[model samples]
Target: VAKQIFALDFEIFGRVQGVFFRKHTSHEAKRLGVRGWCMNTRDGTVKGQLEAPMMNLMEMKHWLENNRIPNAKVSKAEFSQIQEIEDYTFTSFDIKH
Candidate 1:
């Protein structure tokens, strides 16, 4: 049987909207080979989706939870697995109001 890929959505809470969180997240995600986009939600939250070999997301979760992001904080993170997407080619993170 062929391998299946999993996609997931992430919503982060706290001071993670305007502190370059998207940039850093994108940087780390790229370095880790996860593909997706990170953007700010209208409710002042950070939301994004990433698709990778489960391991990548595991590392990402750990980093976000432990790292001390300047002017930004991640009070909570919510993830939901879904169908695969093609939001991987965009360069630089975005702030979608």
Candidate 2:
């Protein structure tokens, strides 16, 4: 059977800014061969989307929830809008300004 592709929306709270979180997040996504974008919000959180196969998507979410820059503090991770997709919406993971 063909692997199922999915999209996930995520927002992280607490100490997400000023720690290169967006850059590292992009790298992690690329490492997992996932495509999407991330950005630091004025509300002091990091928000992003991930599009990939189910395994990669869950792995990325696990990383986002449990791992990050050593100096970064993550209080909460909110994942939403997880749904199957026909194809990737982005060619690469990006850090948005």
Candidate 3:
């Protein structure tokens, strides 16, 4: 199992806003024990950064990019600035304005 931590700047698009995307994202983040903050963008997308173990981060990434919340019509998801991170970077996942 991969125990190393990572950071990711990512976004999910297409019918993602106003669909509880951030809500469920926070849920999944907590479930995966990752740290990050997410918010709705004016461009009708969900954007955030995450820090977590590589394996758990991958799970979160897959969930966001491949399969979003049940009601979310995610047509595209993007990730960048992927890099190794320290656990102190974040204490928990959060939803921001």
Candidate 4:
């Protein structure tokens, strides 16, 4: 069977800004071969999309929900607007302004 591909929009809330969350997220996503971009939201949330195999996507979700920059205090990780996709492609993960 083919591997399942998952794609979704995600947000990390609570003290996410200025804590290097985006930096670490970008790093982790690229390391995991996940394709997407993350950014600091004006509303003080960290927002991004993760697209990858179900395994990798879950790993990324776990990392986002638990492991983060030293100073980041994440209250929760929100995932929505999800669906199966053909593929998630990008040159690499990025930290968007």
- Which has the greatest lDDT? 2
Which stretch of 10 consecutive residues in model 2 shows the poorest summed lDDT? 1-10
lDDT of 2: 0.89
For residues 1-97, write the lDDT of model 1, one tens digit per residue.
Answer: 0234446778888988668888888888778766668787888888887766567656776666765767777787887855654444444334354
lDDT of 2 by residue, 1-97 (tens): 1387899899999998988888888888999888999989989999989999988898899989995666789999999978999988799998888
Model 2: colliding residue pairs: none
After superposing candidate 3 on the true structure, give the runs of residues whose Cα lies further than 4 Å from its correct spot: none
lDDT of 3: 0.86
TM-score of 4: 0.88
Per-residue lDDT value at 62 in model 4: 84
State the C-alpha lDDT per candidate: 0.70, 0.89, 0.86, 0.82
Model 3 lDDT per residue over 27-74, tens place: 999998888999998888899999988888889999997864778888
TM-score for every candidate vs. truth? 0.74, 0.93, 0.91, 0.88
Better of 2 and 3 by lDDT: 2
Candidate 3 vs candidate 4, lDDT winner: 3
Q: Give the root-mean-square deviation of each candidate in angstroms.
A: 3.6, 1.3, 1.5, 1.7
In candidate 2, stretches whose alpha carbon ends up further than 4 angstroms from where it belongs are none
User: TM-score for model 1?
Assistant: 0.74
